[PDB]
Design a protein around this ligand. Sequence first.
Ligand code: K3I
Ligand code: K3I
Ligand code: K3I
Ligand code: K3I
Ligand code: K3I
Ligand code: RET
Ligand code: RET
Ligand code: RET
Ligand code: RET
Ligand code: RET
Ligand code: R16
Ligand code: R16
Ligand code: R16
Ligand code: R16
Ligand code: R16
Ligand code: R16
Ligand code: R16
Ligand code: R16
Ligand code: R16
Ligand code: R16
Ligand code: R16
Ligand code: R16
Ligand code: R16
Ligand code: D12
Ligand code: D12
Ligand code: D12
Ligand code: D12
Ligand code: D12
Ligand code: D12
Ligand code: D12
Ligand code: D12
Ligand code: D12
Ligand code: D12
Lengths: 230, 230, 230, 230, 230
Amino acid sequence: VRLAADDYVGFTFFVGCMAMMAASAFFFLSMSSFERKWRTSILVSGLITFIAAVHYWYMRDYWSGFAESPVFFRYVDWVLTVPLMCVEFYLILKVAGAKKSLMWKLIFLSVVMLVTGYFGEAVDRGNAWLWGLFSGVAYFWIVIEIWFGKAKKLAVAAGGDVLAAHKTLCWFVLVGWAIYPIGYMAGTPGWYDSIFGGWDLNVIYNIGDAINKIGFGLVIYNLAVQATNK
Amino acid sequence: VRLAADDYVGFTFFVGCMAMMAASAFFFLSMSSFERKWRTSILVSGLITFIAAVHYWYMRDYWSGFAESPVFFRYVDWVLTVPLMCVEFYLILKVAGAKKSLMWKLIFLSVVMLVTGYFGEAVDRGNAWLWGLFSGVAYFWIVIEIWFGKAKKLAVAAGGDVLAAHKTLCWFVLVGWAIYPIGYMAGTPGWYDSIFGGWDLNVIYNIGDAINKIGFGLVIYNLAVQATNK
Amino acid sequence: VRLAADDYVGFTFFVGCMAMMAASAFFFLSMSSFERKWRTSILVSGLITFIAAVHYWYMRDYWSGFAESPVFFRYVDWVLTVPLMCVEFYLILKVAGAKKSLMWKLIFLSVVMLVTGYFGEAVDRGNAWLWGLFSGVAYFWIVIEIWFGKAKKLAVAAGGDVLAAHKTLCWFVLVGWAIYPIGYMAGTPGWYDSIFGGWDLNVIYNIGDAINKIGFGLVIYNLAVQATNK
Amino acid sequence: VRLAADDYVGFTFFVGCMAMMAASAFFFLSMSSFERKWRTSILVSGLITFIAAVHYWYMRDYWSGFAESPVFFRYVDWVLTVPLMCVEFYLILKVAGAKKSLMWKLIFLSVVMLVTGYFGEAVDRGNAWLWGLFSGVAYFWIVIEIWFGKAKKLAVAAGGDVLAAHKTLCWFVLVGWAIYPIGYMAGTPGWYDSIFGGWDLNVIYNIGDAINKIGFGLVIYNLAVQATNK
Amino acid sequence: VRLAADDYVGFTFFVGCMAMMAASAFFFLSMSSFERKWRTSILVSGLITFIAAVHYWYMRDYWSGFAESPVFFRYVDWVLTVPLMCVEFYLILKVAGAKKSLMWKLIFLSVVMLVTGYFGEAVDRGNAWLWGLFSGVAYFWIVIEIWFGKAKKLAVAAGGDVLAAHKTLCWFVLVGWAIYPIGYMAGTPGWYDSIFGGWDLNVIYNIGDAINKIGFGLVIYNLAVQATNK
Ligand SMILES: CC1=C(/C=C/C(C)=C/C=C/C(C)=C/C=C/C=C(C)/C=C/C=C(C)/C=C/C2=C(C)C[C@H](O)CC2(C)C)C(C)(C)C[C@@H](O)C1
Ligand SMILES: CC1=C(/C=C/C(C)=C/C=C\C(C)=C\C=C\C=C(C)\C=C\C=C(C)\C=C\C2=C(C)C[C@H](O)CC2(C)C)C(C)(C)C[C@@H](O)C1
Ligand SMILES: CC1=C(/C=C/C(C)=C\C=C/C(C)=C/C=C/C=C(C)/C=C/C=C(C)/C=C/C2=C(C)C[C@H](O)CC2(C)C)C(C)(C)C[C@@H](O)C1
Ligand SMILES: CC1=C(\C=C/C(C)=C/C=C/C(C)=C/C=C/C=C(C)/C=C/C=C(C)/C=C/C2=C(C)C[C@H](O)CC2(C)C)C(C)(C)C[C@@H](O)C1
Ligand SMILES: CC1=C(\C=C/C(C)=C\C=C\C(C)=C/C=C/C=C(C)/C=C/C=C(C)/C=C/C2=C(C)C[C@H](O)CC2(C)C)C(C)(C)C[C@@H](O)C1
Ligand SMILES: *C/C=C(C)/C=C/C=C(C)/C=C/C1=C(C)CCCC1(C)C
Ligand SMILES: *C/C=C(C)/C=C/C=C(C)/C=C/C1=C(C)CCCC1(C)C
Ligand SMILES: *C/C=C(C)/C=C/C=C(C)/C=C/C1=C(C)CCCC1(C)C
Ligand SMILES: *C/C=C(C)/C=C/C=C(C)/C=C/C1=C(C)CCCC1(C)C
Ligand SMILES: *C/C=C(C)/C=C/C=C(C)/C=C/C1=C(C)CCCC1(C)C
Ligand SMILES: CCCCCCCCCCCCCCCC
Ligand SMILES: CCCCCCCCCCCCCCCC
Ligand SMILES: CCCCCCCCCCCCCCCC
Ligand SMILES: CCCCCCCCCCCCCCCC
Ligand SMILES: CCCCCCCCCCCCCCCC
Ligand SMILES: CCCCCCCCCCCCCCCC
Ligand SMILES: CCCCCCCCCCCCCCCC
Ligand SMILES: CCCCCCCCCCCCCCCC
Ligand SMILES: CCCCCCCCCCCCCCCC
Ligand SMILES: CCCCCCCCCCCCCCCC
Ligand SMILES: CCCCCCCCCCCCCCCC
Ligand SMILES: CCCCCCCCCCCCCCCC
Ligand SMILES: CCCCCCCCCCCCCCCC
Ligand SMILES: CCCCCCCCCCCC
Ligand SMILES: CCCCCCCCCCCC
Ligand SMILES: CCCCCCCCCCCC
Ligand SMILES: CCCCCCCCCCCC
Ligand SMILES: CCCCCCCCCCCC
Ligand SMILES: CCCCCCCCCCCC
Ligand SMILES: CCCCCCCCCCCC
Ligand SMILES: CCCCCCCCCCCC
Ligand SMILES: CCCCCCCCCCCC
Ligand SMILES: CCCCCCCCCCCC
């Protein structure tokens, strides 16, 4: 329980936990300052930070206890949050004429991706590469859908601020999420051990997680503010 | 109390606890995002997830402590929630002209069913089969009421979206709940030696619980959203 | 702190604690769906469940710790709640032309009753019968006031649903509360034995408490709903 | 950690903690039931109970642990709350037009009083009587200000219910607070040991505290209710 | 874990924690009594106190445990809060025609300052002076920006109460914050050991922190108050 000055992992847990708790409060308490239709999109963003805050709190204690943060445990959060973020694609293009078919697709993809991930990392480590492959494919499909699929066409039709915030999402998916597949390579045996192996990811996980989720949130909030002021 | 990767029960407690906590927040915070008439129906759906979240949190810790989740302890939650879900039949058809008699019936049935269950499982295990039988009968009665009784006739009279959402609820009762009677068979000795597959009932309980209750919620919420936008 | 199936006291603490927490949420979150005048009556009903929920949580832990629930400790809750329920008489007859004098009387009576009770049970057990007697007298006074006193006359003058809900309250006072004086008889030495074998007082306390308080709540809520819809 | 029936200090901590938590909820949840300008006055009353509830909870645990409640520790609460109560003078006479000069004065006086108190009781007990003297002077100043100073003149100018509630506050300051100076006399050596010495105030502290702060609250709330109905 | 009367650090943690928790409640609960536009500025001020309250709670326990408060641990809070205060410049000049470029600048500067601080104090103590220097420069830049830079000119252009509140903030930055750089000097070896060395700042940190943050809050709140009374 004693703190050390050089414990940079410790620090990043405490910061992340605190920043997620603050963000969660910030979206929950901002909900009320918006027009009827936007609220739900904010609300869900809050949820996302909220689940993370509560899980981070747990992890923050665990690391202080045992000085080890097992990667699979993160999945507890990811399997819940990653889908919600996908749902956030529906809420942005709902005004543009998005169909529940898209919703279902996204959720399906996101869940499969995270379950396959979890199987690769926890359940079946011998055959982890294949699970990786499946998850990879589900990721690519999601990234292709959002970049060149129906979602982009709907966004371009809508145009304006709605388009912009879409793109930034896609960047966050493309660049922000990329760190997670990489960490898998460093986590599981296979043909990618040489390229990525032995890297300390905890700090990168703690910073990235907070950035990713708070980032999404701040985008959707930016979209709401730019839509009310004009 | 360090966690292990292969502890799939552990994982499902943490996920279920987090998903129930999120849903509870989601309905509590969405309650205000509808007109006054729907609110109570949402509110109660939230309550359902809320009671589950708080109980799951307790169970989640217990399993982490002693690595055993006694089945009777689940009843703490079920005796409270199963009635509320039944109440949810009344709240949908209240605008269609439902009578409190129906509500009282449902509550009565649901309570008896769960108490009989609890007697079968906790106090009197030798004569568990009879209690089973009584609970069974209470189940059947409720399924007959909702499928062919006055509830569906009132829904059809109202007609449209109110009907649709009703049916899906009946499916959730019919198919969703079916896992609970089965687990009883696997729990008590008698004329049923029902043990099916290598799957651990705890895991099925943790996933099912969350599905069932989050399911309910999503349906009621879907009904409210499709009724307000038009 | 492992639970047993046969620990029926345990079970009733966990259920009671959970049901009180749910009810407290249910009144707090329903408060806002009413006209300005009703709110306070609901709010206070919630407060009542709220104090109980928080105390029950403490008792629930204690019993899990030491497997003994000292009766005097319940008073911590009762001395706070029993007065509020009395206030609930004032809040429903306030529109009928109740005077604050009545409210003060009620509070006074209820406090004296509970303090005398606490003196009987905690400070001097040798003199417990006399304290009993005094508490008894305060009970009778309250029951006579509400059944045949000014409160009934004001309710009958008002008439309608406001009257009805009054009666049911009086039943809850008359029948619901009766279990508490009985338990005293079983708790303290004197001229009364009140064996009441078989049933465990704790269990009757846990179920009764929840019934009494949730009951009150449901009544006041029923009154508000039946008065607002017309 | 085991409870005793004869532990009247224990009891009063648990009651006080619970009653403060209830009141805090009661003002927070009632805040919305008033016109905009009363809200702040309620809010602050709640804050007062809230800080007390949280400190009482801490003290309640401590006493259960070590069976001793050091008087200086209470100051943690008093230094925060006593100023807020003073602010409550400003918020009631905002109708008739009080000047921030009065606000600042009150806060200044109250803080000095409490700091001098803390110095008398914590750092230098040899020099305690002088600190007493200084605190005394700050008290007297406050009591004379509110009884015969500008505050009374403003209240009389305003007249009506606003005046009434003022007086009762002055009584609470005059009579309610008087127990605190006395306790000092019983706590520290000096020239007042003879008059007041060896007295145990814990029980009197626990009851008084709750009375004083819940009292203020009930007054401000009474003022708001009597000002909206007319 | 028993506390002593002369433990002034202890006392200041408990007061700070309590005062921050109260303030956080006070802004969150006041938020709704304002027009749409001001809310966000209050909200964020509350967030600031909120993060501090939760971190102070942790620190408060730590000191009670180990009787030592490591300086680097404070950074957990500062790295989150110091930026938000800077953002508070944007929210007050937003209606005056502030550009997000200014907000980004401020955040950038504040983050750099705090990171450089953290590097100086945690990871690289040998080269702490250079990090100091860099942080210093980031501070100076911020102070010159707010005193003579774009921010001041924008505030003067939109004079009145918005200007006043600006100045006071600058004072709080100039004078309030100054104690943090000083503490660095007392913490790290270099050319400033002679001037500042061996000083105990814990008590000064705890009082300053609460003043600084509650101060900010009270200013923004004051600005909102004198903006509604037209
Ligand atoms: C897990 C696994 C796999 C999966 C692999 C995956 C999913 C690989 C993914 C690779 C990725 C995502 C590569 C990313 C490349 C580049 C990145 C991350 C960043 C580029 C640019 C940056 C950082 C910033 C760009 C800009 C910003 C900041 C915004 C501006 O608007 C535009 C610009 C200046 C360009 C298989 C399927 C291949 C095999 C299996 O056995 C193992
Ligand atoms: C899954 C699904 C479908 C279903 C399709 C089909 C073809 C389903 C066909 C049949 C199914 C799923 C039947 C499941 C039945 C389960 C039941 C009726 C379980 C009842 C258990 C009871 C009443 C146990 C009672 C007892 C107990 C607990 C202990 C006693 O000692 C003994 C006894 C009285 C037997 C679609 C395709 C239609 C729609 C889609 O949305 C959902
Ligand atoms: C109150 C009042 C007044 C009087 C005010 C007085 C007497 C004083 C006011 C302010 C004072 C004394 C402020 C002092 C501020 C000190 C600061 C901001 C110090 C900053 C230090 C830094 C940034 C150090 C950085 C470094 C570090 C940390 C390590 C590196 O290695 C070296 C260095 C770069 C120097 C008037 C007369 C002006 C106006 C009247 O209206 C009111
Ligand atoms: C008569 C009737 C019916 C049929 C039956 C009903 C409703 C019966 C219900 C009876 C019940 C629930 C009676 C319960 C009574 C409990 C009482 C009066 C308990 C009082 C206890 C006290 C006051 C104890 C005090 C003392 C204590 C605690 C210690 C002291 O040392 C001694 C003493 C003063 C006695 C219906 C339902 C058909 C219609 C209805 O309108 C009327
Ligand atoms: C009959 C009647 C009533 C009842 C009571 C009446 C009229 C009076 C009651 C007086 C009471 C209850 C209290 C009097 C209080 C005296 C106080 C507050 C004394 C304060 C003393 C201080 C502050 C001492 C400080 C010092 C310290 C701390 C130690 C130093 O070394 C020396 C010193 C400076 C003296 C009412 C209230 C119902 C109203 C009306 O109906 C008339
Ligand atoms: C807030 C939580 C976030 C954004 C987490 C994201 C995680 C991923 C997108 C994971 C992707 C994976 C693959 C595509 C390949 C390897 C396994 C996974 C599950 C890490
Ligand atoms: C979240 C809680 C839920 C949905 C629990 C559902 C539980 C049941 C519907 C239990 C039913 C039972 C029978 C119909 C027969 C055997 C005994 C029971 C209690 C398991
Ligand atoms: C929420 C809990 C409730 C309603 C408890 C109520 C308890 C009473 C009305 C107790 C009355 C007593 C007497 C009339 C005689 C003996 C002492 C008491 C306090 C048990
Ligand atoms: C709930 C907290 C309350 C109402 C505390 C009030 C305390 C006082 C007004 C204390 C006054 C004192 C003096 C005038 C002299 C001796 C020292 C003090 C601080 C106890
Ligand atoms: C909530 C606490 C606050 C406002 C703290 C702010 C502290 C700073 C602005 C101090 C920064 C420092 C320097 C300019 C020089 C030395 C290193 C720092 C980070 C302590
Ligand atoms: C550290 C986590 C929380 C960070 C929250 C950032 C503060 C929000 C800044 C922009 C707010 C714009 C308000 C728009 C409505 C007028
Ligand atoms: C462990 C470090 C936590 C880092 C917390 C700060 C997160 C801030 C995220 C903001 C980045 C995206 C901004 C969106 C652009 C409008
Ligand atoms: C939308 C959220 C979905 C969350 C799905 C959680 C799945 C967890 C699976 C746990 C292990 C399954 C059995 C392992 C092999 C016996
Ligand atoms: C332990 C694993 C728990 C996983 C729970 C995931 C949340 C369930 C989502 C709801 C599923 C039914 C959808 C009904 C559509 C109206
Ligand atoms: C006003 C229209 C709102 C439509 C929203 C539909 C999607 C909502 C999904 C969020 C529910 C998440 C449940 C908790 C996590 C398992
Ligand atoms: C909404 C109704 C909930 C009712 C909960 C059940 C309470 C009774 C449980 C059984 C108590 C122990 C009985 C022991 C008999 C010897
Ligand atoms: C606007 C009026 C709506 C009335 C709806 C009927 C009320 C039924 C709610 C039942 C709540 C049960 C709470 C149980 C707590 C354990
Ligand atoms: C272990 C105790 C479980 C008790 C659960 C009680 C649930 C609420 C009961 C409500 C009583 C009926 C009130 C009807 C008012 C119109
Ligand atoms: C309306 C609320 C009234 C609350 C009454 C609280 C009861 C206080 C009991 C105090 C008993 C102290 C021990 C006995 C004397 C040594
Ligand atoms: C609009 C009419 C309001 C009437 C309020 C009567 C008193 C309110 C209940 C008691 C206050 C809370 C007590 C908390 C426990 C000490
Ligand atoms: C430890 C015992 C504490 C008991 C707390 C009871 C609540 C105090 C209420 C005081 C009422 C003052 C009069 C209000 C007039 C508007
Ligand atoms: C709309 C009028 C508002 C007037 C506000 C007057 C001052 C309120 C002071 C509140 C201080 C509480 C926070 C600090 C205590 C920890
Ligand atoms: C550990 C010591 C805590 C001290 C609590 C400080 C309370 C707030 C005082 C700051 C005053 C700022 C005035 C702002 C004017 C609008
Ligand atoms: C404009 C889009 C930028 C998104 C970049 C995300 C970077 C996340 C960093 C994760 C590892 C620290
Ligand atoms: C400490 C990190 C704060 C980051 C704030 C981002 C603000 C950008 C969105 C603004 C919407 C108006
Ligand atoms: C439309 C069908 C809804 C019910 C689905 C069945 C859910 C059963 C529980 C799952 C256990 C893994
Ligand atoms: C318009 C309301 C429909 C809500 C459907 C939500 C589907 C479930 C989401 C599960 C996410 C893990
Ligand atoms: C209509 C009146 C009903 C009153 C019910 C009170 C009895 C239940 C509580 C005690 C059970 C042990
Ligand atoms: C408007 C409906 C009147 C209130 C009756 C509610 C009864 C619910 C009892 C729930 C027990 C689980
Ligand atoms: C007219 C108002 C009188 C208020 C008196 C309050 C006295 C509180 C004493 C509590 C200490 C045990
Ligand atoms: C309109 C009535 C306002 C409140 C009056 C004071 C209430 C006193 C309660 C005493 C403790 C329960
Ligand atoms: C507004 C309230 C301020 C309270 C400040 C208390 C300071 C106590 C210092 C004790 C250490 C010597
Ligand atoms: C109007 C000028 C306000 C300046 C505030 C200074 C606060 C100093 C805090 C540090 C005390 C240890």
